[PDB]
Design a protein around this ligand. Structure first.
Ligand SMILES: *[C@@H]1O[C@H](CO)[C@@H](O)[C@H](O)[C@H]1NC(C)=O
Ligand SMILES: *[C@@H]1O[C@H](CO)[C@@H](O)[C@H](O)[C@H]1NC(C)=O
Lengths: 37, 41, 148, 97
């Protein structure tokens, strides 16, 4: 009867900035800056 | 961490965070125009 | 009224109106874009100039080269950041007006003709209250139908 | 550096601060520019499925306007498997009216 096309969502609160947007929540993210020792 | 580092080290930057998105905007019977299929894992 | 919008003609009149939702989002995006370019630049107090004796020619040359080197790096980056950002700004705007076209096409569905010039023609009579609905995300598809 | 090498110490400091500002600025914009593109990439990919599918289903479905298609002809799990792959057989299905 019906078929839909969509995408993944989850409970993540990881946020990123982009040139156009600020504090965008994403499903997955990678931190590339080392902060600890 | 500190600019005066001895060894084979990452570049030192003045930034606080550098985070790359790898995923989709997390926007949790309807397709993508709504966004949110938490049931599709 | 704004950057992107609508024009209409019906039994009650005609005219232009901006799509305020679309324009404001695009506007905020461009504002954040300009601020990213400017706000990420690091401004510090500096004196720049140095003095050297006539027996320090290699040191003066080292200083000059270091300063010229950074100037070429910052000039090159400024030139490409502006060109790359402008390419994207213009694509951004074209994308946004096309997105209204499909946002609207997808609610109007089969009750309109695509005229091929960025407009839709209604089969069912559509008045100012219909216009308001179409111009927002509220068009009621079930209440309207094709004549033939 | 000694106390009589203040200009050399300052030259060293400036060279190091200069490279730090260059690498910090580049790190900040590379991340922001890449994130803008990652999110556009994902939106493009889900839209590409929508049209990849719309173009095989052609006239045998209704576009519902919310990112879904409704079949005129009854479509079962074997049909679903075909549509979900690049194998939908257009000729075997037809509009009811
Ligand atoms: C988020 O979802 C994951 C996967 O189902 C689960 O393990 C986790 O407990 C949930 N809650 C939080 C706060 O991460
Ligand atoms: C983003 O989130 C941080 C942390 O809560 C906050 O300090 C900052 O002001 C927020 N920026 C915007 C544009 O919302």
């Amino acid at each position: 009867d019906q078929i839909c096309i969509g995408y993944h969502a989850n409970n993540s609160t990881e946020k990123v900035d982009t040139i156009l947007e600020r504090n965008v929540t994403v499903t997955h993210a990678k931190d590339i800056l080392e902060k600890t020792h | 961490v500190h600019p005066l580092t001895i060894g084979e080290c990452p570049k030192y930057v003045k930034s606080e965070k550098l985070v790359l998105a790898t995923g989709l905007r997390n926007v949790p019977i309807a397709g993508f125009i709504e966004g949110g299929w938490q049931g599709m894992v | 009224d704004g950057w992107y919008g609508y024009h209409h003609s019906n039994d009650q009149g005609s005219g232009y109106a901006a799509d305020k939702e679309s324009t404001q989002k695009a506007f905020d995006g461009i504002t954040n874009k300009v601020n990213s370019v400017i706000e990420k630049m690091n401004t510090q107090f500096e004196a720049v100039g140095k003095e050297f004796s006539n027996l320090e020619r290699r040191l003066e040359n080292l200083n000059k080269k270091m300063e010229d080197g950074f100037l070429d790096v910052w000039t090159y980056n400024a030139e490409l950041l502006v060109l790359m950002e402008n390419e994207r700004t213009l694509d951004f705007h074209d994308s946004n007006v096309k997105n209204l076209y499909d946002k609207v096409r997808m609610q109007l569905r089969d009750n309109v003709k695509e005229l091929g010039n960025g407009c839709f023609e209604f089969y069912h009579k559509c008045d100012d209250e219909c216009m308001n609905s179409v111009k927002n995300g509220t068009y009621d598809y079930p209440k309207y139908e094709e004549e033939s």
